[PDB]
Design a protein around this ligand. Structure first.
Ligand code: FAD
Ligand code: FAD
Ligand code: TRK
Ligand code: TIR
Ligand code: CL
Ligand code: CL
Ligand code: MG
Ligand code: MG
Lengths: 487, 492
């Protein structure tokens, strides 16, 4: 159907899962096929009305709900996951949530994709932004399994058409397939479905997860934590990840997130997942936990459970708490090395100061992600060890400026020696387009002289611009931080 | 053909539901893709003498599916479609669909909903035929009040399986079987493949199920346990009880409010309440405030109160309503229907057992708003017989260490027994309580050591509906292929 203001569904469908952003579309179309997408597109382009696509609605920025967007194509009716006998690959429609993808692939076929934690995320935005997750160190990015994609595009004359692009070098649309391996949503056209398989039995055509995992939750009380203690914990963790994130590391089967929380929360915490298949799994876990707490002087509460693998993906310790109400602002960076002492000092001061819920999360990364050449996909960061996510959440819709400023100042200060942004090719490797932050393109917050596009895409940017020029010459698909041809 | 045996990578997940207390030993778990595949699993299991069980959403609070004696499981995961069936004129929900997919698909696509559970992960398979209710029940009734027809694979005396359709039409030959699916409970009559749902009351899908409110007010209210004595606790409980006694009739304007009051262990630091109210009237905020003021009056403890206004579909995924999604760890649940609110001795026992330092160190008694339009339905019209209650009361304890089951099971057994001590330790129907709800099953209701009331488990769950359920059992499952603790069973 089509949803317009006044329809009972309008208040829900005008929003994604980020409540800071309220869309004003004149029409939201729950499209049912490529053919219906082509008709909504060609009609919007003729009218001069700006469009956007919503799949899972997890965009951290206002790309879909931007007040200029007059027409939304919502992919909820296209949520199938299955094996496509004709193409010999798994077909994930854009509106499928990760929880549905993982349940279907694993229960029916015993396989999985190494995408996000977070069952409510849609495939649409997630895959073509370079999705990664708990199994990425073991199995790479989800885009490392992208075999082909179906996408509705608009030509110079304004007519919409459906094309298939694939990983085969001789594919005439090969360049468009490459741009879907991390190029980001909302840039090239409307993805209808992705086809994924390893680069003819379905059970053999995607990776098999561990049957069981050890999951641990470790908590340090903040009350008895001084700066030196905090700094040793952070340095322990960063040194361990600097040593143990290569593509041939035995530690490819470990994932963890260390949460550096505001002191007012009462505790810092870390969640770890380790493949439990080996009979020494428990010893290996403890050696990782011991490394993180060595010399800290605070004993953590520690609890470890063995869980079947599909059950573990729904545990809020990995999946997050599912609460998408209230208001949040995210920033993020790639880390090639962990923070230096001065940055640790900044973190400690900003986390303990009574100047607000807020966390800096360090998410294990690298491993098999890093076996891929930096230019093979549009995910150009293939030597990092951690993704660092800065977050502040609040409730009062009248108090956005103060929370945005807190997180802006923290991030600027951490990256102050590189113009306030994580400039690639140093201790940092730029930014991740599925954690978009419009401040990276803001002269007031980015003083590095490096454009937002090089921070997200590094050297992939020129190729993406060429794909943009070829496949979206009219620039129908745009938003803050969208791939844009040279002026 | 899609089957999982020990040694398969999928076996550890598929041998369990969402209750980690219960580890199954089936020789095969079949991921059935159709009614015909269910018939071939059933007929083979019957000719072998192998005990069967069905798993849809995996949310069973008891060991009905994962019982070690179950040899063959039919897992309905592949049967998860939700859509409109034009030819039937009703919405079709396959048993493997989760409530989250149900509400998303019905609402986004058609702007309608079903007044079923809170809890997006629950499967339709067990949830509807147990009499599912939720946030919207006071406004729209139980989900079974929209069950028009069912498709179910059943086994006859000779041991052959077939697929039948049973509908709400009085002249339908299978009308009795339809009736038993409006609250008879899972794992009793045969394998439901799909449910068809529509208002009993124009043939547009957008008018054939109730529309939810477009927006709701949602409130979380928290009272610190620190400055809270027995008199203050008792006043809060009594306030809430009286309000529900007065405001839960089928014609009450308060049919559009739902709330959960959590009487937590004092160890937890705070008592809390979540309230949802239809926000579309222009005085919704003043109405919410009057309900909150009634709950807190003269309590002497100022609650911390947070109200947000949310679009309806978004509200159903807020953990304040949906729960926190954490099904790891171990839990024991007991429950009862309340026709009137707790008396002095009961409030006293709750206070004592919520503040006591005994056992080990979690627990909660949650009072869930009920009644409203549920109670407009005659008690014998469906297999949900409790049609005059005002609250469902759920007793819970949770823990992590799998070596510590007894102390936790004992805590909650003694708390519940003590609350219902004046009636043999169990909520005997037709008094202050109205028995128990089959989607919150508790095997201790059939245990002579915990039920000294003289009233059998079957009358507690089903009241006068039981002999009719038994007649359906005799006719449709004569071999008793479908059984578990607390399964409908013909007379000896
Ligand atoms: C909210 C949330 C996000 C998470 C979570 N966990 C993650 C994880 O463990 N690893 C990750 O890599 N990412 C995680 N993320 C982030 C998500 O990956 C991003 O928020 C994704 O971009 C979201 O995808 P989706 O849910 O589909 O978001 P939308 O808002 O619909 O779209 C985002 C963006 O992409 C464009 N787009 C959507 N659909 C299409 C199609 N079919 N074709 C082209 N472009 C599309 C949109 O217009 C928009 O620009 C955990 C949580 C809780
Ligand atoms: C875990 C959980 C349960 C909840 C939650 N919230 C509820 C709410 O707000 N209102 C409710 O009324 N109930 C809520 N519940 C309880 C569920 O309603 C019950 O736990 C349901 O019985 C669960 O159904 P399902 O998830 O399908 O569980 P299973 O364990 O697969 O089945 C239970 C029972 O039913 C039999 N059965 C399943 N499938 C079939 C079919 N197709 N045909 C016949 N019989 C079937 C099973 O064999 C078993 O006997 C919130 C949470 C978080
Ligand atoms: C591990 C992980 C990876 C992800 O990629 C995302 O999911 C996880 C669980 O966590 C990531 C990050 C550490 C956490 C975030 C941002 C917390 C968000 C939050 O609390 C709220 C809102 O977004 C709206 N209202 C809220 O309350 C995040 C980026
Ligand atoms: C409001 C609800 C209605 C539903 O009928 C169910 O959902 C809701 C959200 O709350 C109910 C009850 C108050 C809470 C329970 C059982 C908590 C369970 C719980 O914590 C756990 C488990 O069940 C397993 N591990 C765990 O940790 C429950 C019966
Ligand atoms: Cl934008
Ligand atoms: Cl049983
Ligand atoms: Mg949050
Ligand atoms: Mg819990």
């Amino acid at each position: 159907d089509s949803v317009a203001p006044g329809d009972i569904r309008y208040e829900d469908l005008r929003r994604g899962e980020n409540l800071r952003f309220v869309g004003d579309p004149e029409e939201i179309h729950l499209v049912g096929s490529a053919a219906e997408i082509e008709q909504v597109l060609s009609r919007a382009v003729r009218s001069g009305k700006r469009v956007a696509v919503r799949s899972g609605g997890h965009c951290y920025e206002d790309f879909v709900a931007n007040s200029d967007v007059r027409v939304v194509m919502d992919m909820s009716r296209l949520s199938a996951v299955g094996f496509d006998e004709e193409r010999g690959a798994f077909a994930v429609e854009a509106g499928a949530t990760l929880g549905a993808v993982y349940k279907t692939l694993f229960r029916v076929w015993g396989v999985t994709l190494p995408g996000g934690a977070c069952p409510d995320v849609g495939a649409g935005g997630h895959i073509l932004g370079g999705g990664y997750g708990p199994l990425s160190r073991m199995h790479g990015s989800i885009v490392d399994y992208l075999h082909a994609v179906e996408v509705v595009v608009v030509d110079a004359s304004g007519d919409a058409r459906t094309v298939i692009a694939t990983r085969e070098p001789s594919d005439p649309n090969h360049d468009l397939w490459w741009a879907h391996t991390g190029g980001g949503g909302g840039n090239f056209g409307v993805v209808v479905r992705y086809w994924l398989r390893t680069a003819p039995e379905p059970g053999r055509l995607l990776p098999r997860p561990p049957a069981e995992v050890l999951l641990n939750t470790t908590v340090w009380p903040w009350e008895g934590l001084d700066e030196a203690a905090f700094a040793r914990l952070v340095r322990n963790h960063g040194r361990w990840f600097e040593q143990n994130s290569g593509p041939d590391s035995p530690w490819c089967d470990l994932y963890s997130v260390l949460a550096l929380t505001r002191s007012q929360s009462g505790a810092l915490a870390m969640t770890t997942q380790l493949d439990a298949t080996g009979p020494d799994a428990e010893k290996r876990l403890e050696t990782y936990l011991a490394a993180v707490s060595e010399g800290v002087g605070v004993q953590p509460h520690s609890d470890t459970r063995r869980l079947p693998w599909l059950h573990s993906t729904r545990w809020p310790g990995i999946a997050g708490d599912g609460d998408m109400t209230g208001r949040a602002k995210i920033k993020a960076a790639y880390a090639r090395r962990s923070f230096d002492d001065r940055q640790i000092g900044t973190l400690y001061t900003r986390l303990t100061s009574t100047d607000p819920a807020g966390v800096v999360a360090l998410i294990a990364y690298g491993g098999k992600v890093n076996a891929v050449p930096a230019d093979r996909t549009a995910v150009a960061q293939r030597d990092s060890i951690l993704k660092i996510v800065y977050v502040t959440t609040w409730e009062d819709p009248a108090q956005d400026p103060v929370h945005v400023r807190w997180i802006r100042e923290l991030y600027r200060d951490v990256y102050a020696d590189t113009g306030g942004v994580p400039v690639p090719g140093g201790a940092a490797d730029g930014a991740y387009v599925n954690y978009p932050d419009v401040d990276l393109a803001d002269e007031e917050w980015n003083t590095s002289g490096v454009p937002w596009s090089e921070l997200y895409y590094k050297d992939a940017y020129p190729r993406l611009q060429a794909v943009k020029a070829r496949w979206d010459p009219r620039n129908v698909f745009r938003h803050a931080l969208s791939v844009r041809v040279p002026p």
